[PDB]
Amino acid sequence: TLKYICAECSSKLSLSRTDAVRCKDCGHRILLKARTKRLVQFEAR
Amino acid sequence: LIGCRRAEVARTFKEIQSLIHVKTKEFGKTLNIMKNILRGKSEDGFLKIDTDNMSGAQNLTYIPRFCSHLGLPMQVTTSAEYTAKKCKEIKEIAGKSPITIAVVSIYLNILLFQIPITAAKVGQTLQVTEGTIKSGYKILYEHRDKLVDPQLIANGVVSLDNLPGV
Amino acid sequence: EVFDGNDIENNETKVYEESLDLDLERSNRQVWLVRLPMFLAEKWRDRNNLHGQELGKIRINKDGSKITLLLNENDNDSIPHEYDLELTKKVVENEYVFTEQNLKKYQRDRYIPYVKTIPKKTAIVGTVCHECQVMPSMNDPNYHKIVEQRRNIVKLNNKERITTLDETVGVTMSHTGMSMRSDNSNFLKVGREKAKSNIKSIRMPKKEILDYLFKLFDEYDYWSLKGLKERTRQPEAHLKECLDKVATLVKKGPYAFKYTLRPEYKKL
Numbered sequence A: 001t002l003k004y005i006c007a008e009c010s011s012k013l014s015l016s017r018t019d020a021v022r023c024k025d026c027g028h029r030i031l032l033k034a035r036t037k038r039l040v041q042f043e044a045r
Numbered sequence B: 001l002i003g004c005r006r007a008e009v010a011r012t013f014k015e016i017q018s019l020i021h022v023k024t025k026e027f028g029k030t031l032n033i034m035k036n037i038l039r040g041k042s043e044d045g046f047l048k049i050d051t052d053n054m055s056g057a058q059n060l061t062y063i064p065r066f067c068s069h070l071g072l073p074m075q076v077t078t079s080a081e082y083t084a085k086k087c088k089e090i091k092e093i094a095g096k097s098p099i100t101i102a103v104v105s106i107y108l109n110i111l112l113f114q115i116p117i118t119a120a121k122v123g124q125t126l127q128v129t130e131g132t133i134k135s136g137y138k139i140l141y142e143h144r145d146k147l148v149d150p151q152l153i154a155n156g157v158v159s160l161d162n163l164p165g166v
Numbered sequence C: 001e002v003f004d005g006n007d008i009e010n011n012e013t014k015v016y017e018e019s020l021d022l023d024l025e026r027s028n029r030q031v032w033l034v035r036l037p038m039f040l041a042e043k044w045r046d047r048n049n050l051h052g053q054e055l056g057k058i059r060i061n062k063d064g065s066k067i068t069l070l071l072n073e074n075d076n077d078s079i080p081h082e083y084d085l086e087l088t089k090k091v092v093e094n095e096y097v098f099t100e101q102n103l104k105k106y107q108r109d110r111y112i113p114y115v116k117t118i119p120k121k122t123a124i125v126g127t128v129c130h131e132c133q134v135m136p137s138m139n140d141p142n143y144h145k146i147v148e149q150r151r152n153i154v155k156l157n158n159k160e161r162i163t164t165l166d167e168t169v170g171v172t173m174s175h176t177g178m179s180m181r182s183d184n185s186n187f188l189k190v191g192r193e194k195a196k197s198n199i200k201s202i203r204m205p206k207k208e209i210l211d212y213l214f215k216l217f218d219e220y221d222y223w224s225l226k227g228l229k230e231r232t233r234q235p236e237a238h239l240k241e242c243l244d245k246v247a248t249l250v251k252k253g254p255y256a257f258k259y260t261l262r263p264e265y266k267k268l
């Protein structure tokens, strides 16, 4: 459901609630939440 | 054993017998009585949905530990997990103990991935009879297509001819 | 040879054939106390060597009493064979050599006849008047072979580093804690060697068991439950039913907690 990226192999995964947090390609148990798709506004000062 | 099963981290009966010197019959009867009174206390207190935590087989949770005891890579472990999941569909081995199912799946994927580990070493490490492992591999050789992950052979990392015949 | 001290019964004559007096006829021999370096003490004290063979010669130049050792070539070749015996004391006082040999056990004014004296044969080997030290000679070509060896003393390390397991860590942890591998060692299997002994018996009749109890009471007046049970091989319930009729336990005597025959049957 929610997009994550494995910390070492950098493969995009989709994890649901019941899924254990673990990479399906290289098995690294550290996953990063994907950057938000909404545009974020910064003042250039 | 109950604490291991509740945390989705369940060990086997052989593990607990390896630590605690207890006879099999009294340990099984004690486990049955404690499961009964735990269900009774859950019904009397806060009801808990099992959602496959008191499952007798739990063969998905033995594959990573048993692969770690053999020092296998990850892709062998996930191929063995897929093989053990698909072994439930096979009615010829559905009655087998989940230790034996996990071990024959691991050995099938060791032969599939050309890992140089003999059946004797797998039997010595996981305390399964080598004849049992050989019979499980023989009875699983007819269903090679269903057990092996199709995406693995699609990507070409493994091929079905690597498995020796019977 | 442990033996009682201060024996006035002259028991040492019968049990020790050798005389207990100190032998002094060898005390007139001249003995040179010599201190050796590491290599000469190593090769001059081993028991697999020194079969009585000659090891060298002693040259005493009388111009200045200079003492040298000319070693034979039978020992090594890398070591020097010419040495200087330096004398740190020309006259050494109050120093002797005594040897001890084991005996043959076969064939105020107030005194106590027990002092725990160990009798051993003693004999003065000689008199020491020269304290000697052996230096390697400067001019020997093998002298540097000593010095580098001495430089090899401080250079080598007698301890090895720890061994690092280079294999997969899962294979190392396979034997640890939770493992399928049941223990196959037989070290301290006390429950294996003690729970295998099971006693099985029947209700063998009353007359024979009471006769057996009378036989054991005639052999010895005092018995216990466990000893009588292992002697007659009967169940505890059947043995107890026969003991209280003809015997009783002692509650306050010096032989308490033991089943003994009744005083009515005691005179029988």
Ligand SMILES: [Zn+2]
Binding pocket: A006, A007, A008, A009, A010, A011, A023, A024, A025, A026, A027, A028
């Ligand atoms: Zn990954």
